[PDB]
Amino acid sequence: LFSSPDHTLDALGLRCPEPVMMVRKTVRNMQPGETLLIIADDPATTRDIPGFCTFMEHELVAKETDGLPYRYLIRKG
Amino acid sequence: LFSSPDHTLDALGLRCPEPVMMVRKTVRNMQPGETLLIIADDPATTRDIPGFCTFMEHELVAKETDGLPYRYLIRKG
Amino acid sequence: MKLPIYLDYSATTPVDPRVAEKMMQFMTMDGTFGNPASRSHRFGWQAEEAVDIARNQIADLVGADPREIVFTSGATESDNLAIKGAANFYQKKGKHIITSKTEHKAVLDTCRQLEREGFEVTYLAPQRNGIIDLKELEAAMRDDTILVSIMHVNNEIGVVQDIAAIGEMCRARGIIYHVDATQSVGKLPIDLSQLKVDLMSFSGHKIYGPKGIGALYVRRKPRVRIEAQMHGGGHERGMRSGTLPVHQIVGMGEAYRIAKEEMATEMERLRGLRNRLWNGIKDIEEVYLNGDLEHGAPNILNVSFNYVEGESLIMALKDLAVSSGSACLEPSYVLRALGLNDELAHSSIRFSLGRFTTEEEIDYTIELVRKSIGRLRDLSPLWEMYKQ
Amino acid sequence: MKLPIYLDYSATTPVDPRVAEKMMQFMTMDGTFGNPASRSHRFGWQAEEAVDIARNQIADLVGADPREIVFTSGATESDNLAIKGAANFYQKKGKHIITSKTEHKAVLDTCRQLEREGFEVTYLAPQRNGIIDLKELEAAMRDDTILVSIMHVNNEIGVVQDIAAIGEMCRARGIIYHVDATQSVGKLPIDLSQLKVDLMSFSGHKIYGPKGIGALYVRRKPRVRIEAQMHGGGHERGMRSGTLPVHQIVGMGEAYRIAKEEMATEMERLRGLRNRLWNGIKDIEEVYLNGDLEHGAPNILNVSFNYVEGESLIMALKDLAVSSGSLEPSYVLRALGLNDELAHSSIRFSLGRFTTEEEIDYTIELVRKSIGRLRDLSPLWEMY
Ligand SMILES: *Cc1c(COP(=O)(O)O)cnc(C)c1O
Ligand SMILES: *Cc1c(COP(=O)(O)O)cnc(C)c1O
């Protein structure tokens, strides 16, 4: 389910609010429907990234938060 | 020439930009045509007060700057 | 109505149409876009006149003289300016400062910065209705106490401090008194010609003015002085340097003018709506009012809902734009200062009303809260525990 | 055209209509009025998106990463933040700072405050053309030198410093280099991915954005750090706390976007008009160009007029909205060596987006016969 991401984003080492900043910019230069693999180790992303999806009308395909690093598959709405 | 002023203003002890600040305010609750006697000892008023008259479309009736304190008679335009 | 319903006026308010109408006249080429510092031509002189008008509109609201008004970029800067400015100027008389644990971050964080600069600061715990005990304040005062900072209205629970009394205590001992009045301005009556406050901060976006603008009242008599924190030309009588944002200042002035006018009527209306909201939920089994209903701001209502998971509470009331005061993680530092345990603090909601709030919206809110708390407590293992 | 003619774009510029209509959408109830710090609802999340868009537009102009962009209330604060922030953070490495005598007050007065706080500051005198001699700079540097601050484009005379070379000099010695680029931004190309600048300040109202907003570039790699001067919640990633003024931020971003777009064409037009104006007055007997025609900003022309009384000069050019940089005369011209009388009769012509050929020709003629009829009445000119 993390096999076919159109774009990837190495957010390792980044801490709030940087991870979401990078996500905002990357999602803006993406086509509606493309996917983005987000790799992070900022614990806040377990809250921030799904929040980015809820409040910004985007779809959270699949998350991995039970260990480091985390993984988030996002599909641009 | 300084005998019949409608309003008075003691600006003694005041320093730029205060004197002109007080003039703006006093001229604001003045009727168009009334006169204001300004007493000041701020050297800058020799430039600033006629400047207030030039750029704010007001009329400088009579100034007195050959000593302290200074005296300016303006008529609300 | 529209959805979601905005009940977060304490975080920020929408700009008044009249305010935005004025601001738009001091921006483009065909407006008064001039720099108030350009003394050589008219573009500068008439922009300066507008600044003066707005400066008097602001002063008239709080009963001060325009010369006592120092323009800043907001309440944060004003709090930094006042506290750091006074601490530095009067350090020869002492290095001890007193404040409250429930103050806004701008005050608290400024104090910690002064602590790492050699200053000693006392953070007073509040009584659990939010009120500061003046006897504990007095017991903290000393010979080397130069400054006290206690806010007018608390931004999270809305409690009102007795700033007049605190001013009396300070003036009598030659202590500088700073009040953060960001939440109280245009809501509670303020007259600096009577109050014994030396420094007071206010903003624009809490009272339907634009963000990015604020002011700091600096007492003229008895004269209070501060060290500027912003250098570069000695503007604002040497207390705050930088270009004057005309359109912003005009907007804040116009907002303060409107405030003075609609204040008495609007606050009675909000006080009514606030009481309407509390009475509609106060009979729910385990809810708690955080603050003081009878001497709290007319616009703020902080309520705790017991035996519900806080995270789901915000999601259940998604029809409402509110706040929990949570930081980022962990819960409001103001609530745990009062003594609420982390879980109760998490499941607390701060309803704040404004001049767009209708009875229609309050009744919708009342129903939604009743229905949601009942629904959540059904799914709640925690609530099952309470019923035993 | 209309009168008076505005030739004071260096003091401030008018807000671009495009910029203004963007700002209007982030103020009232039916706009994006939310607080970008309210994480519990969409009013805040959407306001934060607009902030991010503007943050990237600003970064794209100067070739930086959005994470390096710190929002301030203007260039004044940016200069204060950069200088005081770096001075305090790196004081364990030394307390000596170097700057220029012709820097904007925000820089000079900030350094003076730091001297009062125990720091040592060297104010270098410029050359006659306004240019700093890099060898005099090198000689000023020491082991305990932690910070250098030298602006890109001078706001009075428009002279352009060699900030690339200065950056090379600083980085090589581990010295922090701050650049005040308030006048150069949107006028001269800037690429921080190439430039060896650690800190850079810019504003909005100098390139047709709104007053009361600005930013500070803080290099991410090699990592540069500063101590915050504004405390209260640790916003802007711990470097500048306070609520983000979205409408202001949007206006500044939009202004930076337009700048990146119309930069090349507009600056060609500007230095074209700039050369048109100088050619039209350069043959008046005793006039003097302050700065450098060949490496000065394309939008600034500082000219001194000899044997004329300064006070009356500004009155004779009543049809023009200009500046003299002045009872006391420009400290920049004084630094250049101009005597006080010459400095008082110096005029700074600054061009902009609305300046036309027609206005320049009108200006040329106004200057010709103004200087002529002033020197008629001048006992000063009679002796010459
Ligand atoms: C909002 C607020 C501030 C900060 O105001 P800004 O202008 O956004 O910096 C300070 N104190 C209190 C009590 C506030 O509610
Ligand atoms: C105008 C200017 C500043 C000040 O910018 P503000 O945002 O108005 O405070 C600083 N440096 C230079 C070179 C300037 O021209």
3-state SS string for chain A? CCCCCCEEEECCCCCCCHHHHHHHHHHHCCCCCCEEEEEECCCCHHHHHHHHHHHCCCEEEEEECCCCCEEEEEECC
Residue D213 tokens, joined: 């907003």
Q: Which residues of A touch D71 (CB under 8 A)?
A: none
Question: Considering just the CA atoms, what is the radius of gyration of chain A in Å?
Answer: 11
> Alpha-carbon distance C383 to C386, whole Å?
5
CA dihedral sign, ordered C155, C160, C161, C165 = positive
Q: Hey, what amino acid is at D15?
A: V
Spatial distance between the Cα atoms of D302 and D319, rounded to a whole number of angstroms: 18
Q: Is B70 helix (H, G, I), strand (E, B) or coil?
A: strand
Distance between CA D6 and CA D2 in Å, rounded? 9
Phi, psi of D273 (to 5 degrees): -70, -35
**Structural resolution in Å:** 2.4
Q: Tell me the C-alpha distance between D28 and C210, whole Å.
A: 9
- Contact present, B32 and B76 (Cβ < 8 Å): yes
Ligand number nearest CA of D179 is: 2
Q: How far is residue D51 from each of residues C125, C148, C252, D239, D255, measured CA to CA in Å?
A: 37, 36, 22, 16, 14
Residue reference for tokens 């600005």 = D214
Report the alpha-carbon angle C82-C88-C92, nearest 5: 130
d(Cα D64, Cα D58) in Å, to the nearest integer?
8
Residues in Cβ contact with D175 at an 8 Å cutoff, skipping those fewer than 6 apart: D141, D145, D146, D147, D148, D169
Pairing outcome for strands D69-72 and D346-350? unpaired
CA of A8, closest CA in chain D: separation in Å? 18
Among all bound ligands, the one having the nearest atom to the CA of C10 is 1
Task: Give D237's contacts in chain A (Cβ within 8 Å).
Answer: 17-18
Domain boundary assignment for chain B: 1-77
Cα(C37) to centroid(ligand 1), Å: 28
Q: Determine the Cα–Cα distance for residues D277 and D302; give it in Å rounded to an integer.
A: 11
Helix (H) or strand (E) holding B60: strand B59-64
Burial C71-109 (b: 16+ CB within 10 A, else e): bbbbbbbbbbbbbbbbbebbbeebbbbbbbebbbbbbbb
> Which of 168-227 (D) contact C at CB < 8 A?
205, 210-213
Helices C42-62 and C246-279, packing angle to 10 deg:
30
D35 contacts on C by Cβ (under 8 Å): 8, 11-12, 211
Ligand 2 closest atom vs CA D213? 7
Residues whose CB is less than 8 angstroms from the CB of residue C386 and which lie 6 or more positions away in sequence, other chains included:
C286, C306, C307
* Ligand 1 lining (C-beta closer than 6 Å): C 74-76, 104, 106, 151, 155, 180, 182-183, 203, 206, 214; D 242-243
Residue type at D177? Y
Scan for tokens 């944002």, then name that residue: C245
For ligand 1, atom 12, name the residue with the nearest CA.
C182
- Annotation: binding site of D: 75-76, 155, 183, 203-205, 243
Distance from CA of D80 to the nearest CA of C (A): 7
Burial label for C350, CB within 10 Å (0-12, 13-18, 19+), is buried
HSE (CB half, 13 Å, CA atoms) of C119? 30
In the block, residue with structure tokens 């209309």? D2
Please state, in angstroms and as integers, the Cα–Cα distance from residue D366 to each residue in D280, D317, D360, D372, following that order: 11, 7, 10, 10
Residue type, D298: P
H helices present in B1-77, as ranges: 18-28, 45-55
CA C195, CA C150: separation in Å to the nearest integer? 14
Task: Mark yes or no for CB contact A21/D52 under 8 Å.
Answer: yes
**Max intra-chain CA distance, chain A:** 30
The H or E element spanning position B2 is: none
Q: From the CA of D74, how far away is ligand 2's center (Å)? A: 7
DSSP state of B3: S
Nearest to D41 by CA among C127, C315, C145: C315
Method of determination?
X-ray
Taking CA atoms only, the protein residue closest to ligand 2 atom 8 is C243
| Strands C120-124 and C96-100, bridge-based pairing | parallel
The CA distances from residue B64 to B24, B37, B47, B55, B58, in Å, are 20, 11, 12, 20, 17
The CA-atom distances, in angstroms, between D82 and each of C166, D177, D224, D227 are 38, 10, 11, 9
HEC profile of chain D: CCCCEECECCCCCCCCHHHHHHHHHHCCCCCCCCCCCCCCCHHHHHHHHHHHHHHHHHHHHCCCCHHHEEEECCHHHHHHHHHHHHHHHCHHHCCEEEEECCCCHHHHHHHHHHHHCCCEEEEECCCCCCCCCHHHHHHHCCCCEEEEECCCECCCCCEECCHHHHHHHHHHCCCEEEEECCCCCCCCCCCCCCCCCCEEEEECCCCCCCCCCEEEEECECCECCCCCCCCCCCCCCCCCCCCCCHHHHHHHHHHHHHHHHHHHHHHHHHHHHHHHHHHCCCCCCCEEEECCCCCECCCEEEEEECCCCHHHHHHHCCCEECECCCCCCCHHHHHHCCCHHHHHCEEEEECCCCCCHHHHHHHHHHHHHHHHHHHHHCHHHHHC
Q: How far is the CA of D203 from the centre of ligand 2 (A)?
A: 7
Give yes or no for a contact between C306 and C354, defined as CB atoms under 8 angstroms apart.
Answer: no
C110: annotated binding-site residue? Answer: no
CA-CA distance, C282 to C371, in Å (whole number)?
14
Residue D214 — φ and ψ, nearest 5°? Answer: -165, 180
Report whether C306 belongs to an annotated binding site.
no
User: Distances from the Cα of D48 to the Cαs of A53, C226, D32, D38, in angstroms?
Assistant: 14, 35, 10, 9
For C107, residues 6+ apart whose C-beta sits below 8 A from its C-beta are: C79, C83, C99, C149, C151, C180, D232
User: Which residues fall within 8 angstroms of residue C183, CB to CB, at 6 or more apart?
Assistant: C10, C151, C152, C153, C154, C155, C158, C206, C297, C300
The rounded distance, in Å, linking the Cα atoms of D121 and A4 is: 58
Catalytically annotated residue among A10, A12, A16, A54: A16
3-state secondary structure chain C: CCCCEECECCCCCCCCHHHHHHHCCCCCCCCCCCCCCCCCCHHHHHHHHHHHHHHHHHHHHHCCCHHHEEEECCHHHHHHHHHHHHHHHCCCCCCEEEEECCCCHHHHHHHHHHHCCCCEEEEECCCCCCCCCHHHHHHHCCCCEEEEECCCECCCCCEECCHHHHHHHHHHCCCEEEEECCCCCCCCCCCCCCCCCCEEEEECCCCCCCCCCEEEEECECCECCCCCCCCCCCCCCCCCCCCCCHHHHHHHHHHHHHHHHHHHHHHHHHHHHHHHHHHCCCCCCCEEEECCCCCECCCEEEEEECCCCHHHHHHHCCCEECECCCCCCCCCHHHHHHCCCHHHHHCEEEEECCCCCCHHHHHHHHHHHHHHHHHHHHHCHHHHHHHC
Q: Cis peptide leading into C222, omega within 30 of 0?
A: yes
Q: List the one residue out of D296, D243, D290, D277 whose CA is nearest residue D358.
A: D277
Structure tokens at C124: 């007073």
* Nearest atom in ligand 1 to C11's CA: 1
Q: Which amino acid is at D43?
A: F
Amino acid of residue D66: P
* Domains detected in chain C: 3-15+263-372 (3.90.1150.10), 16-262 (3.40.640.10)
**Of C219, C212, C99, nearest in space to C154 by CA:** C99
What tokens does D343 get? 């400095």
Nearest CA in chain C to A48: C328
Residue C148 touches partner D, C-beta closer than 8 Å: no
Q: How far apart are the first and last CA of chain A?
A: 18
Give the Cβ contact number of residue B51 at 10 Å.
17
A near B: at least 3 beta-carbon pairs less than 8 Å apart: no
Q: Pick one of 3.40.350.10, 3.90.1150.10, 3.30.110.40, 3.40.50.150 as the CATH number of B1-77.
A: 3.30.110.40
Name the residue among D118, D112, D111 with its Cα closest to residue D95: D118
Lining residues, ligand 2, CB within 6 Å: C 242-243; D 74-76, 104, 106, 151, 155, 180, 182-183, 203, 206, 214
SS3 B25: helix
What would the two tokens of residue D68 be? 């390096």
- Which atom of ligand 1 is closest in space to residue C73's alpha carbon? 7
Residue B41 DSSP label: -
Give the Å distance between the CA of D378 and the centre of ligand 2.
36
Residue of C101, C152, C203, C252 best suited for mutating to test ligand 1, as the one with most atoms within 8 Å of CB: C203
In angstroms, rounded to a whole number, what is the distance separating the alpha carbons of residues A39 and A8? 8
